[PDB]
Design a protein around this ligand. Sequence first.
Ligand SMILES: CCCCCCCCCCCCO[C@@H]1O[C@H](CO)[C@@H](O[C@H]2O[C@H](CO)[C@@H](O)[C@H](O)[C@H]2O)[C@H](O)[C@H]1O
Ligand SMILES: CCCCCCCCCCCCO[C@@H]1O[C@H](CO)[C@@H](O[C@H]2O[C@H](CO)[C@@H](O)[C@H](O)[C@H]2O)[C@H](O)[C@H]1O
Ligand SMILES: CCCCCCCCCCCCO[C@@H]1O[C@H](CO)[C@@H](O[C@H]2O[C@H](CO)[C@@H](O)[C@H](O)[C@H]2O)[C@H](O)[C@H]1O
Ligand SMILES: CCCCCCCCCCCCCC
Ligand SMILES: CCCCCCCCCCCC
Ligand SMILES: CCCCCCCCCCCC
Ligand SMILES: CCCCCCCCCC
Ligand SMILES: CCCCCCCCCC
Ligand SMILES: CCCCCCCCCC
Ligand SMILES: CCCCCCCCCC
Ligand SMILES: CCCCCCCCCC
Ligand SMILES: CCCCCCCC
Ligand SMILES: CCCCCCCC
Ligand SMILES: CCCCCC
Lengths: 155, 1033, 144, 48, 48, 48
Amino acid sequence: SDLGKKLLEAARAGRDDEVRILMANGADVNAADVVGWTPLHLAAYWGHLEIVEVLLKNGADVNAYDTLGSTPLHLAAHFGHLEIVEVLLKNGADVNAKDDNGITPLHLAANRGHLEIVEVLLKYGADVNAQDKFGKTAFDISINNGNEDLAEILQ
Amino acid sequence: MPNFFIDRPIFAWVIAIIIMLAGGLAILKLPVAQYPTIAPPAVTISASYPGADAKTVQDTVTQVIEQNMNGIDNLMYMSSNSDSTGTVQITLTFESGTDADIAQVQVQNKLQLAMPLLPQEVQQQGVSVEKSSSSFLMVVGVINTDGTMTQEDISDYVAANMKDAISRTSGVGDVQLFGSQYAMRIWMNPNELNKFQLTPVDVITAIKAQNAQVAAGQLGGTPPVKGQQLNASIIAQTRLTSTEEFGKILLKVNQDGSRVLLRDVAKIELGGENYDIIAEFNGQPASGLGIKLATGANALDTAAAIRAELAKMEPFFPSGLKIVYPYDTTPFVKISIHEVVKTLVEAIILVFLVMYLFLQNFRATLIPTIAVPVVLLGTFAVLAAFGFSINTLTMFGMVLAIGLLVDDAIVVVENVERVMAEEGLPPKEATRKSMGQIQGALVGIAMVLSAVFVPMAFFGGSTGAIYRQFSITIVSAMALSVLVALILTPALCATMLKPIAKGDHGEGKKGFFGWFNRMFEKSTHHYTDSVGGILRSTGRYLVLYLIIVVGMAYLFVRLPSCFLPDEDQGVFMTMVQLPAGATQERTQKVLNEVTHYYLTKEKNNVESVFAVNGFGFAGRGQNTGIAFVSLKDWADRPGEENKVEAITMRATRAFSQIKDAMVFAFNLPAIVELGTATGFDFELIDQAGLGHEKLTQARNQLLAEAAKHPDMLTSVRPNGLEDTPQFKIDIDQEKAQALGVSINDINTTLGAAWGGSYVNDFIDRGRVKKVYVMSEAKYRMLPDDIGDWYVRAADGQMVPFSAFSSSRWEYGSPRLERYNGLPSMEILGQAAPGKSCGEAMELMEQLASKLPTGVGYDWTGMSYQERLSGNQAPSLYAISLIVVFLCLAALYESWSIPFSVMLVVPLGVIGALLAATFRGLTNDVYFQVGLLTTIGLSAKNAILIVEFAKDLMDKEGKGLIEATLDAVRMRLRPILMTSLAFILGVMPLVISTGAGSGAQNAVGTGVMGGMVTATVLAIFFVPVFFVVVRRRF
Amino acid sequence: TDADIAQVQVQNKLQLAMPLLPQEVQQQGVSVEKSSSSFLMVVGVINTDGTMTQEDISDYVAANMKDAISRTSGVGDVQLFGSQYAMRIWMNPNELNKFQLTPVDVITAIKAQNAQVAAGQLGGTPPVKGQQLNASIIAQTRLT
Amino acid sequence: GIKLATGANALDTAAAIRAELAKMEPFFPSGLKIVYPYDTTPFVKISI
Amino acid sequence: PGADAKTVQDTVTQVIEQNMNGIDNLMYMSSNSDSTGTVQITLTFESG
Amino acid sequence: ERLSGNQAPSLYAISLIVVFLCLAALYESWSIPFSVMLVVPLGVIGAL
Ligand SMILES: CCCCCCCCCCCCO[C@@H]1O[C@H](CO)[C@@H](O[C@H]2O[C@H](CO)[C@@H](O)[C@H](O)[C@H]2O)[C@H](O)[C@H]1O
Ligand SMILES: CCCCCCCCCCCCO[C@@H]1O[C@H](CO)[C@@H](O[C@H]2O[C@H](CO)[C@@H](O)[C@H](O)[C@H]2O)[C@H](O)[C@H]1O
Ligand SMILES: CCCCCCCCCCCCO[C@@H]1O[C@H](CO)[C@@H](O[C@H]2O[C@H](CO)[C@@H](O)[C@H](O)[C@H]2O)[C@H](O)[C@H]1O
Ligand SMILES: CCCCCCCCCCCCCC
Ligand SMILES: CCCCCCCCCCCC
Ligand SMILES: CCCCCCCCCCCC
Ligand SMILES: CCCCCCCCCC
Ligand SMILES: CCCCCCCCCC
Ligand SMILES: CCCCCCCCCC
Ligand SMILES: CCCCCCCCCC
Ligand SMILES: CCCCCCCCCC
Ligand SMILES: CCCCCCCC
Ligand SMILES: CCCCCCCC
Ligand SMILES: CCCCCC
């Protein structure tokens, strides 16, 4: 897609006004690059909140997953983008989505010590006992990393 | 001194001969080259870390080297890039004038001490230090036309049978192989490895063990048992030499006694060191040699010698192998030289004709015909003394000089002839008297013109290197011309010129000459009448002078200023950039389309396309390439539509239709050695450990702000690569330890298979070459393949990568840049139409001041030069003006009269600007040096008018107007003579088309326009100047 | 004597000795300088708000100032009056013995787990026909 | 502590050192200040 | 160390010699490679 | 040896020419210098 590509580039770049015009012209919100990232993936990774919102209004798949099973929520949680985490969840993001390694948004937020994001994930039903492929929980991560504050949150 | 030599013609001849011998010898020994060295010295450190990403390269190599680059003299700046092909280049640039050999050795010696701090794999590949020079003399292409040889095959053949002999050819300074010699390629199969419970680690160990050179000792070595009869070296294991031997390397013997050989787990072949470049010449596999010219060498002779050596090689070539020559700079050198010699000869012919037309005797025509070559030969000797070469710039210097050499010869001869006609003196007495009238002025002039041309030599940086070529050539020529005019030409005048009876101005001759003489005597009367009328009404001419000065100023500021003109160099480039993550295969598709366009749509103009997949200048990688396009000879490309400008425009237009790729054509810069000289070259700098992402955001902030000022800034863009998706794989340490799998085995297995590993060397038909192990392609393409690789645990079990790893996509940089030791991003751009580079720079600085805390900036390359080099021009012009004034004051014994000469400057400049503007040329170096020549010549005419007028006033007691009128009458003829000779002499330059005509036109146009107005205006205005100035004081 | 030549000659002889020196000496970096023995100047750096300790200041200077001064022409040598930061592992022999470990185990672990691995590429050259994807493989990076 | 390279001009080197330090100052953390406790060059300049 | 003359020529001497071109004022270059593993390459330059 | 012998003709030639030219300059003559330079073989024979 000509306009799908342009949209991928614009979502990544955070070019807000360019995303708008592209939405007006029917640029494919479910365009995917070679690694399976949608515009929503891109905007989530790079922390572009307004663009996330616009894409969701225009019927972006909130639980699109990449070629390794990661979702926009995974990326927003991992890279500390609280508002985007909230927006995604409000729009039905699977709070317990596992990637191909059995890693969840909670695992990722925990690993980077993003306290507020962990609480939001928990508030929306994040499974605190979910294990990755190595049998590890967000709690295990917090302990290994020596994050006392995050350990206390995860009882 | 004239009087000395008038009585000593033989001594004069002796001096002339010595000069000619010196010059002749200098012509024989002088180096020939297109351009002198202009770029400041640069040394580049290059390293390769097989399989490494950019960050790995930076953080284990680049930073380590950079931190050890201290205590090196005359360093201006240091820049580097580290990229995802595993490459680092660090470039150190030194102050102009630095001895490059010392710079190189200092850099190398600091690198040598940093080597122990680098990764083993980098120490094993080694690190290179070279002088940096995109000044190739030529590129020799080598292709196979019968489909029997791959590019790797060709490159090996060239390395083994051609390169070394080219390297030893006379005048060859350096030779780059565009490719690699063969490497022993072990292509591993993970299925087979797992079947026998083996890993790449076992493969590498086996190769190191079984492909080695082992020391032993001697039989009967010292100290011996006395009585020993024999001493002999003991030879033990030596390197393998063939794929067959590598194939039989023994990996393992199974319990049942069967043998596992290397060929049972891998494919074995002679292949390339590297597979990132695919090079094609008109669609066929290609390699080649980039050849640089040795210091001091003759370019033309070297090119000829290179050809002769290749001819000797052709009879031994394998089938289908063919030499091509896709780039050669020596045609320009050849043509440039031929054109200057032709010009010089034409000048002599034209002077002869003009002399004969006016003076109407052959004896007089011979005097300049001797003197000009004497001065020129002398000038060559002076060039040789000061270490200059015969090159484009020095040769144009000599073309520009012609009009001054010619003038000095005309002035002397003409003036004697006039004295003989007016006073009836015999030749020798006339010469003595005549020389009396001019000798002081000739000396004054030498000072004036030294003041005009010398200051230019004292510019700095690259611009100074260019200017200095013109300045030394012209000043030398001019000084020799005055010496010859004080020594040789008076002697020749006194001994060669026939007497003329008092009053005989040839009016009583018959036929054409009779008519001409009567016409010219009458035209002088009309001229002098006119001046008389002008001098009764000097007020309105001072108004016209002001209009000229204002008009000059107007035209000057609006004339675009490039430093050298663009040439059709017979070659240009097309850039190919594909989206992030695009493959070699896709880029090749595009390059094929590009090559197709040129071979079909431009069949009359394009000789060849050399397409290089995997290479660009702003970064390498699978998604980039270049096509070098080499054109048919200028002769077979008549008309503007078949020149590089039109061709690149059509090409670029066409290639905009290409989808999912950025493709466009662009000409080379005039001097390829200093790269693009239009624009600014800005560096954005992380001054506070901000990091890559924060620096990119700040870059975007500045680029976005730059785009809001299109009235000041154009094409403001990064000279780098954008972040791309990358595959992050995390080894789980706990699981590895639990399974008994060592981290070193994991990392070797991953890196050897997916990245390749340089194991050791072997000997292929007597040449040492490398051994690489790597996965066969089909097992290292996709994420799922990771799990097909097994590692052996301590307990002998084979564990798949999937069991102890996890992976995710992320973004990272494929090319990280650094400037003076700090993270950086290079930003290119230019001043908008009608703005100076200065104002653009100023604005860039203001914008940059508003960026986030910790983000600095700096100017590099041509921007750096400009900022240092550009604040000196005013001082130099000021000094020049002052020295001119002072010399004239000495000459005329007056503080006021020098003003009457100096006011002439605008009269030539206006004409040059008119001609340049109308022909749409630039204020370039050639135009500037031509202006200086025009100014000099017009100043010379004015000086002699004023000297004669002042002399008539002081010596003969004549009134102001009477003397001015007699002065201009006497000086009309020599001025029309020199002007007509010179204007015609430069005509060929003006109308020139084809090779080097950019330069020829720039030189010739400004001078022709300048000389018209300098001549036409000065003969009316200089009398005004003298009379006004004298009246005022 | 031309000091540049003196330096080169000294360094050429030194490079024959380099391989014979202990690894630990080679790894600290051996320097060859041509300079006065005494100080042209001392450039001091303080914090006037008392918000940086001596150690902090010294690190700032080592990491953000020293190298550029060192490369400035006419600067023969630069002594830091203080030290750059390093990652300090301060070992406890009681704890080491409790787990049957030694400094040797510590060093091995650090070399293994504070590592910067060249891992190659997906779809790297030479590729299979049809390959759509090319991307760097990122494995272990230096700890921070 | 800065030592002068063999044969180099003390005043020019000091000047170059100052120019380079000037480029660093704008990016200093709060409170960081350059002081000049010991310099042999001012005497040369001033004595001349 | 331990290499025969041919080995040292093919892995050292030839490698060095192939880089020894386009050096100023070089008259001639000679070399030997011997069974003790030693290489000596001598480059002689124009007087002056 | 091969260089020394191959340059001797040039050296004798230029030396003879310079002597002639200096004499010409000195005595303001082409004929007096020719009269003098004819002597050269009378000395050269003795040397040989
Ligand atoms: C190759 C070089 C030569 C190329 C030829 C160029 C042609 C252009 C020539 C222009 C010369 C000016 O021409 C000259 O102008 C002055 C004006 O002040 C005239 O002067 C006349 O008019 C003015 C006022 O009207 C009176 O003060 C003056 O007494 C009277 O004679 C001259 O009679 C005329 O000959
Ligand atoms: C009797 C006295 C005669 C003196 C004559 C002097 C004036 C005529 C000489 C021609 C010069 C014209 O060119 C003038 O100079 C410089 C060359 O340094 C040109 O070109 C360059 O100058 C400096 C050189 O570092 C740069 O900073 C500048 O950015 C660039 O444009 C300018 O565009 C122009 O202003
Ligand atoms: C018969 C001989 C003919 C005469 C030829 C003489 C050539 C002159 C040679 C000296 C060259 C001058 O080179 C040098 O340029 C720099 C340019 O920044 C000048 O410096 C000038 O510019 C700087 C920068 O704006 C000013 O701060 C300074 O006050 C000013 O003088 C130096 O004062 C001058 O000495
Ligand atoms: C290549 C050398 C050319 C020199 C030519 C010398 C010409 C001699 C003419 C002498 C005339 C002197 C008048 C008395
Ligand atoms: C013999 C006539 C006296 C004039 C002398 C000319 C000198 C002019 C140039 C002086 C510059 C130093
Ligand atoms: C650049 C210096 C200009 C000085 C002008 C002085 C003019 C004085 C003339 C005296 C003649 C009697
Ligand atoms: C007749 C007196 C001549 C005066 C000396 C000649 C001046 C030229 C010297 C460069
Ligand atoms: C007066 C001119 C003398 C010319 C001598 C040329 C020197 C060449 C050295 C090889
Ligand atoms: C102006 C002197 C140029 C002499 C070099 C010509 C060489 C031609 C060789 C092909
Ligand atoms: C950068 C200073 C270079 C000085 C060149 C001097 C030229 C002398 C002119 C005759
Ligand atoms: C730069 C030197 C200019 C000197 C001019 C002298 C003027 C004298 C007027 C009486
Ligand atoms: C090469 C020197 C020539 C001398 C000629 C003398 C003419 C009468
Ligand atoms: C003394 C006059 C000698 C001139 C001889 C001329 C030969 C060409
Ligand atoms: C009268 C002076 C003679 C000059 C010699 C070159």
